[PDB]
Write a protein that binds this ligand. Structure first.
Ligand SMILES: Nc1ncnc2c1ncn2[C@@H]1O[C@H](COP(=O)(O)OP(=O)(O)OP(=O)(O)O)[C@@H](O)[C@H]1O
Ligand SMILES: [Mg+2]
Lengths: 370, 147, 234, 50, 147, 234
């Protein structure tokens, strides 16, 4: 089945960024293919970010050491997309939808494009159905409801991943499909998380989207948006879980600070002007795009919901930094974990004085609220 | 208008002739070396341009400049450089046949036939920035997707 | 009056126009999409030779480097009138609520307008009668003045807004405008729409007396920048 | 359960290896056929779209 | 095509300059008359272009040929925008007169005409970054003297 | 192959190669440098028509523009195997001890390799007794896992490391690798040599079970940058 594809030439490939020369009529976020050549039997995709006059600066979703100057790139017409559906439950997949646990191919029929507009302005609904974390401190004082994005902010080692995994494990029969996006997290820690999920039988409804630290900064940059698209499909179409059409998704971004670091890396390698703390100017926009896609749709649009649990590490408990303040502004509530409380025996370590949940009692059962 | 057109064409032809004739005259020879090699086979502007080109010694692609001279008469744009790659070395008859066949764009466009025998029995024809690939290696990957 | 896109870097679009038909500094670019709708940009910098740098107001995830752009001559035109009352709008003035589009007969006004001159300003500050005891006693407003609430959620700020709208609509004519600039879509929408639609006064809902323009965090920076000006025009 | 998952992974890897070997064998057979018959017969396919 | 730019542009500019310079001296000549008039020391194409137009009698348009001469090896976009403002709307022969007197600035560069009816008589000539005003300057200078 | 140096900015060397023979991203190029000894640079970037930016990993303070560079075609290859046991190497895998060079029969592995996949990860770990009260009580040293000490300038990082090596290096039950990236050659090494050669495990010294790659504070940035990768490859 022969087709004509647009071809460009890699004129400068560097630290995961390639200038693709003439790729006219390329969409602003297409997937350039880098077809296999002598020495490489696979395709290394890339995202055509900067469409400058006579140049296409594209970040590379993979290892850039194989790409060479003068290589031909074919522009696949599709914008960056991730496979979605029932087939991804219980599978660890890199942000491109390719399995990395080696349990077989991902059986899918629909590929939802990442980086989608927010679900809507009037399409949402008031958050009423609670998300039962299983932690008394969270479930009583800082409630989380379906469709509410609740930041988990803390120091380097205070229990943020522990809280997220406890929330994921608790959703055994509550009709929730969990997603764990591991951005910049070491592969051994992602393996430990997957082992913990499998041990408690929480891998029948969990999707792990891991872009580890070794993998290129483009994969880490698109790591949350993939997975957010997965949850969007789950809340918009539903998946058959335990014989029920579950339309509720709970997505946990393992560390959005590492995502911001990856975005800063890909922006500075593209030579875009820096901003505060060397981050690009539109990183608040970066995180607001991702977190505003978590919504509780009304009954006219399906009635599904997507619950986001971003995780942030703060250096020396400085919650006044750039990315922490941005994501605190974006989210609907904060869970502050402190090392001082963690060492003093308070294992959940929530600083209930400063932890807030703007949804409030509406995200609690009437018994718990009373 | 008309007088300018004939004048421009004549100047372009003269420049092309000078470049083709004197390209190898100062080719490679440095500024001091090609200064003697610089013959009277150029206009004073053409001689100055050749001296500038051969001052560094890059007077090798001057014939391309000669090829640039005639196209600049008609505003160029006829390059339409296409590249054909097939697994077997192309025989002259079929090479000419496919050269003539890609007449949909400009006719016998600039074609640099390649082999790359890693291909199996197919054509990779890149016209400008549009590539057509019916090579059986492409079908090979398009079936191998079953992996 | 038609140019071609040259560069696309995020939500900043560079577009080259003909030499004698370059758009002004705040005109709309209005890139037409294949699927019927259009992407309305806003010029920000005239530069070069017919080249204008503009802010996207949209995603720009489906645009090539050759798409045509149709200058609208005037800045972003927003519907103003009694028709645009009790309705929810975006930065471009397109009604994002369930009801139908605004009719062509409604007057469209430029988003960018000159503030009133010095001569028209009141020479003496005047108190603004809200009706709330603590507000009208401790921190009185100003006619044509600015007041800021420093409060989170669950403190009744939304109810205070609703009562202010109701009181101004009862005692005076008191039409109200609400511009949610960079708000959470959950808090700003479907928890302001529903609460104000449910809240009623003289058998008329508060939402019926209030215009809403919403530029939320998900929208590009230009939308959040110009939503305030949209509300000011309305 | 871990043993069953490992068995499933091994079966998937064996299927992948079988597919790769089949692709390599098909490539070798196609190369031999092209060497025998000649790739010139494919030249007529250049007019399908160009 | 890229290599053409320097040499071709230099040759075309030299030809245009030579034709424009010889336009005053070589006016209404013939082949032999312009051969004795136009300097033969110019480029081989330049002398031919100077003689051929006069031989056919089109020597008056030969200077206009010079106008197209640089554009044959240039983007031809650097034409002065000699705006001409006059309250009286100008006829085609008027515009031809203006352009033919305006070629003294570069050549027949891009000229745009406007009305500005509030002018009386005269014409405002804006060539590049030099403006000559001769229409209402007198009255308003007079009102400045009076006040 | 057979490029020419264009620019020498610090330890970063830009070299122009033929159009069709440009080195890959991580290939190793070599300046003959005369005297029978060559400077091995590692490519880092490809800039255009045969221009590549590489890191010298050497003095790069006595070579001029226009010097030829030979493209090896492979990344830095270091010896691996039992032949590297008990020997001290550079970043390039060249021994610096008095003993002879590694033989050609010894396998050469590139210093740039993919990390273990997600399948290969082993999450099983158990306590490793180290004999230090604070380490074995508060933050147990992990067998088969990653651990580190974060210390300032004046604190005793070197003392703690040396004590750990002395405690756990006799009962290794395996081989060991020590990488001296950016550390003093006074204590960081050449006295760990004295301590490792003095320690004896049943007539076989601890140094006989150790591969030591150095690249210390005196070396230029490239050596300190790739010495860790060389040690990891070994
Ligand atoms: N009851 C508890 N609740 C939460 N954390 C606990 C509890 N008991 C122990 N911990 C600590 O929490 C750790 C789990 O990892 P944690 O959630 O703190 O990671 P993290 O915040 O993501 O940090 P890192 O950045 O180091 O990966 C355990 O290894 C242990 O040290
Ligand atoms: Mg974590």
């Amino acid at each position: 089945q022969p087709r004509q594809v647009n071809v460009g030439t890699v004129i400068a490939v560097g630290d995961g960024v390639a200038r693709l020369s003439g790729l006219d009529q390329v969409v602003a976020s297409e997937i350039v293919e880098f077809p296999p050549k002598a020495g490489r039997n696979e395709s290394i995709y890339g995202i055509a970010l900067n469409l400058e006059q006579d140049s296409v600066a594209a970040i590379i979703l993979g290892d850039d050491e194989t790409i060479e100057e003068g290589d031909m790139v074919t522009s696949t017409g599709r914008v960056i997309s991730v496979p979605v559906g029932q087939g991804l439950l219980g599978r660890v997949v890199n942000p491109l939808g390719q399995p990395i646990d080696g349990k077989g191919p991902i059986v899918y029929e629909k590929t939802r494009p990442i980086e989608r507009i927010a679900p809507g302005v009037i399409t949402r609904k008031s958050v009423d159905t609670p998300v039962q974390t299983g932690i008394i401190a969270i479930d009583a004082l800082i409630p989380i409801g379906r469709g509410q994005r609740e930041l988990i902010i803390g120091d380097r080692q205070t229990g943020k991943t522990a809280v997220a995994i406890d929330t994921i494990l608790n959703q055994k029969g509550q009709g929730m499909v969990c997603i764990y996006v591991a951005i910049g997290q070491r592969r051994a820690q992602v393996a430990q998380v997957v082992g913990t999920l499998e041990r408690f039988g929480a891998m029948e409804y969990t999707i792990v989207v891991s872009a580890t630290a070794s993998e290129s900064a483009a994969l880490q940059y698109i790591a949350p948006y993939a997975g957010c698209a997965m949850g969007e499909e789950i809340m918009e179409n539903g998946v058959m879980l335990n014989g029920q059409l579950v339309k509720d998704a709970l997505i946990v971004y393992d560390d959005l600070s590492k995502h911001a670091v990856a975005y800063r890396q890909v922006s500075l390698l593209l030579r875009r002007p820096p901003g505060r703390e060397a981050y690009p100017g539109d990183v608040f926009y970066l995180h607001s795009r991702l977190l505003e896609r978590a919504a509780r749709l009304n009954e006219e649009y399906g009635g599904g919901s997507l619950t986001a649990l971003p995780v942030i590490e703060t250096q020396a408990n400085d919650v006044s930094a750039y990315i922490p303040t941005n994501v605190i502004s974006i989210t609907d509530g904060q869970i502050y974990l402190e090392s001082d409380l963690f060492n003093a025996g308070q294992r959940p370590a929530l600083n209930v004085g400063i932890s807030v949940s703007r949804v409030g009692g509406a995200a609690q059962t009437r018994a718990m609220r009373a | 208008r008309a007088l300018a057109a004939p004048l421009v064409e004549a100047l372009l032809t003269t420049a092309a002739e000078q470049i083709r004739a004197a390209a190898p005259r100062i080719a490679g020879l440095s500024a001091s070396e090609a200064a003697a090699v610089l013959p009277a086979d150029l206009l004073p502007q053409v001689r100055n341009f050749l001296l500038t080109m051969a001052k560094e010694g890059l007077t090798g692609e001057l014939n391309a400049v000669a090829a640039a001279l005639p196209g600049y008469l008609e505003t160029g744009s006829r390059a339409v450089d296409a590249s054909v790659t097939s697994a077997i070395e192309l025989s002259a008859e079929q090479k000419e046949r496919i050269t003539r066949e890609l007449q949909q764009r400009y006719g016998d466009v600039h074609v640099t036939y390649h082999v790359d025998p890693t291909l199996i029995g197919g054509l990779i024809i890149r016209v400008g920035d549009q590539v057509l690939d019916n090579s059986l290696r492409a079908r090979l990957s398009a079936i191998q997707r079953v992996l | 009056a038609k140019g071609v896109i040259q560069e696309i870097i995020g939500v900043v679009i560079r577009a080259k126009f003909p030499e004698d038909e370059v758009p002004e500094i705040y005109n709309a670019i209005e890139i037409p999409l294949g699927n019927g709708d259009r992407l309305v940009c806003e010029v920000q910098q005239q530069l070069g030779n017919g080249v204008v740098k503009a802010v996207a107001m949209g995603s720009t995830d489906g645009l090539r480097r050759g798409l045509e752009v149709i200058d609208t001559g005037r800045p972003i035109a927003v519907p103003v009138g009694p028709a645009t009352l009790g309705r929810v709008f975006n930065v471009l003035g397109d009604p994002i609520d369930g009801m139908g589009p605004i009719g062509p007969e409604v007057e469209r006004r430029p988003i960018h307008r000159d503030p009133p001159s010095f001569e028209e300003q009141n020479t003496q500050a005047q108190i603004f009668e809200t009706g709330i005891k603590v507000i009208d006693l401790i921190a009185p407003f100003t006619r044509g003045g600015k007041t800021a609430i420093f409060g989170g959620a669950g403190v009744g700020k939304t109810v205070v807004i609703q009562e202010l709208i109701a009181n101004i609509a009862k005692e005076q004519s008191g039409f109200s405008v609400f511009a949610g600039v960079g708000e959470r879509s959950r808090e700003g929408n479907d928890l302001i729409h529903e609460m104000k639609e449910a809240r009623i006064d003289e058998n008329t809902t508060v939402f019926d007396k209030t215009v809403m323009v919403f530029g939320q965090m998900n929208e590009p920076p230009g939308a959040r920048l110009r939503v305030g000006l949209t509300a000011l025009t309305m | 359960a871990q043993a069953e998952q490992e068995r499933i992974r091994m079966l998937s890897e064996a299927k992948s290896q079988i597919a790769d070997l089949v692709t390599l064998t098909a490539s070798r057979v196609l190369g031999a056929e092209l060497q025998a018959r000649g790739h010139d017969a494919l030249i007529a396919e250049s007019l399908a779209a160009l």
